[PDB]
Swiss-Prot record, chain A:
Effect of residue 97 to A: Strong decrease in c-di-GMP-binding
Other notes: The cGAS-STING signaling pathway drives sterile inflammation leading to type I interferon immunopathology in severe COVID-19 disease caused by SARS-CoV-2 virus infection. Tissue damages in the lung and skin lesions are caused by activation of the cGAS-STING signaling leading to aberrant inflammation. Endothelial cell damage is also caused by activation of the cGAS-STING pathway: SARS-CoV-2 infection triggers mitochondrial DNA release into the cytosol.
Annotated Gene Ontology cellular component terms: autophagosome; autophagosome membrane; ciliary basal body; cilium; cytoplasmic vesicle membrane; cytosol; endoplasmic reticulum membrane; endoplasmic reticulum-Golgi intermediate compartment membrane
Origin species: Homo sapiens
Residues that coordinate or bind 3',3'-c-di-GMP: 9, 14, 97
Record keyword DNA damage present: no
Taxonomic classification: Eukaryota, Metazoa, Chordata, Craniata, Vertebrata
Modified residues annotated as Phosphoserine in this record: 75
Any one GO biological process: autophagosome assembly
Oligomeric and partner information: Homotetramer; in presence of cyclic nucleotide (c-di-GMP or cGAMP), forms tetramers and higher-order oligomers through side-by-side packing. Interacts (when phosphorylated) with IRF3; following activation and phosphorylation on the pLxIS motif by TBK1, recruits IRF3. Interacts with RIGI, MAVS and SSR2. Interacts with RNF5 and TRIM56. Interacts with TBK1; when homodimer, leading to subsequent production of IFN-beta.
UniProt disease annotation: STING-associated vasculopathy, infantile-onset: An autoinflammatory disease characterized by early-onset systemic inflammation and cutaneous vasculopathy, resulting in severe skin lesions. Violaceous, scaling lesions of fingers, toes, nose, cheeks and ears progress to acral necrosis in most of the patients. Some patients have severe interstitial lung disease.
Name of the featured protein: Stimulator of interferon genes protein
Protein localization: Endoplasmic reticulum membrane; Cytoplasm, Perinuclear region; Endoplasmic reticulum-Golgi intermediate compartment membrane; Golgi apparatus membrane
Sorted UniProt keywords: Autophagy, Cell membrane, Cytoplasm, Cytoplasmic vesicle, Disease variant, Endoplasmic reticulum, Golgi apparatus, Host-virus interaction, Immunity, Innate immunity, Ion channel, Ion transport, Isopeptide bond, Lipoprotein, Membrane, Mitochondrion, Mitochondrion outer membrane, Nucleotide-binding, Palmitate, Phosphoprotein, Transmembrane, Transmembrane helix, Transport, Ubl conjugation
Residues of the full protein shown: 155 to 335 of 379
Gene expressing this chain: STING1
From Swiss-Prot, chain B:
Region entry Cyclic dinucleotide-binding domain (CBD), spans: 2-169
Signal peptide: none
Superkingdom in the source lineage: Eukaryota
Source organism per UniProt: Homo sapiens (Human)
Higher taxonomy: Eukaryota, Metazoa, Chordata, Craniata, Vertebrata
Subcellular localization: Endoplasmic reticulum membrane; Cytoplasm, Perinuclear region; Endoplasmic reticulum-Golgi intermediate compartment membrane; Golgi apparatus membrane
Residue window of the full protein shown: 155 to 335 of 379
Functional note: Facilitator of innate immune signaling that acts as a sensor of cytosolic DNA from bacteria and viruses and promotes the production of type I interferon (IFN-alpha and IFN-beta). Innate immune response is triggered in response to non-CpG double-stranded DNA from viruses and bacteria delivered to the cytoplasm. Acts by binding cyclic dinucleotides: recognizes and binds cyclic di-GMP (c-di-GMP), a second messenger produced by bacteria, cyclic UMP-AMP (2',3'-cUAMP), and cyclic GMP-AMP (cGAMP), a messenger produced by CGAS in response to DNA virus in the cytosol.
Designated gene of the protein: STING1
Regions of this protein lying in the Cytoplasmic compartment: 2-169
Residues at which 3',3'-c-di-GMP binds: 9, 14, 97
Record's protein name: Stimulator of interferon genes protein
Tissue: Ubiquitously expressed. Expressed in skin endothelial cells, alveolar type 2 pneumocytes, bronchial epithelium and alveolar macrophages.
Amino acid sequence: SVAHGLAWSYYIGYLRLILPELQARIRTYNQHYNNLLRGAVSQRLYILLPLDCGVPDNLSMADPNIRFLDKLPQSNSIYELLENGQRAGTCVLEYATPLQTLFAMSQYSQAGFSREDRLEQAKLFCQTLEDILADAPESQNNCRLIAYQESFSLSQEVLRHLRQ
Amino acid sequence: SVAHGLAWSYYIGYLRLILPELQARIRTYNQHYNNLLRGAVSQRLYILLPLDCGVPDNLSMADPNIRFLDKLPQSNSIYELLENGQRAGTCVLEYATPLQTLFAMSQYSQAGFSREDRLEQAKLFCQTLEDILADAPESQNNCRLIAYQEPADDSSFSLSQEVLRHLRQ
Ligand SMILES: CC(C)(C)c1ccc(N2C(=O)c3cc(F)ccc3[C@H](CC(=O)O)[C@H]2c2ccc3c(c2)OCCO3)cc1Cl
Ligand SMILES: CC(C)(C)c1ccc(N2C(=O)c3cc(F)ccc3[C@H](CC(=O)O)[C@H]2c2ccc3c(c2)OCCO3)cc1Cl
Ligand SMILES: [Ca+2]
Ligand SMILES: [Ca+2]
């Protein structure tokens, strides 16, 4: 099961290191860099987990209601989320980039990995990641996993989690 | 088994992309960017796979007989290898950095991952990675995996000697 190792790496080699000082980085942005009125960036890292493992080049080509806003200071990006043609939220948003391995494996004949195998691994990755973060010290209330399957709205998917 | 996913990621996300173009990068370097009165860099990517999963940050401090030379142009580094205090070879050398996950996990109480669990996973990583590269198109004659278990006795192993043995083959 390839997902097991991907989810551990994602956590241990990345989340474990960026999550402890994430809220301070958002706090600096809100207080000193934010030129947006009433639009404060949310306190959590929103992680996009598409079950089809399709990670685009840039986030905005996937949805026109997701617009790049700034780089989070001190590798992370801030986006504005549109609802009804208006800014409905602002957050630090990204893809769980280890999903690229599952998509690349499904695209390599010698891996013997079908689309059905990919979907199962994608789901397994999400569940293993949920279990790791649940027992993780630095991941108490600063991380949000947005798992989804696909006119679909990626912005409406993020906004529901933001409202939570 | 954490190793299965690490080995696939290492290959599909990295090796598959750098190996096809590697020999041309070394050729250009040797012809246009290398110092005249010095050794030509070897044509393969030498990958260090320590079974204890200890990746050293700065490779030049793991062994004093391994000295940084230059960056390969167009993320890869060139090193000189010393034998008896003299330059015995030059190559593009690196660690299989996904091994860092196995070491970090062994250092995290909540992972329930022992040293014995880590050794088994490093073994499976090497085993999987070898099988992948064996059937892989882009791995022509441009990649060598250097797997090594450091023996209890410090006097019976040298990292530079380990690399030079592969370089000579
Ligand atoms: C489709 C392309 C563009 C080829 C791609 C992109 C990224 C990745 N990566 C991963 O999937 C990956 C997987 C992990 F479990 C941990 C970290 C990464 C990282 C995640 C990241 O960089 O955001 C990465 C990866 C995969 C293999 C590597 C590596 C990095 O760095 C050098 C060693 O091998 C893989 C592919 Cl197939
Ligand atoms: C000990 C420290 C320093 C904390 C460490 C260092 C590297 C890594 N990485 C990996 O182990 C890793 C594992 C993979 F399967 C593929 C690619 C990577 C890459 C390999 C590389 O960068 O050379 C990486 C990794 C691991 C998780 C990631 C990521 C990158 O990029 C962003 C997404 O999550 C992990 C740790 Cl624990
Ligand atoms: Ca010893
Ligand atoms: Ca010693």
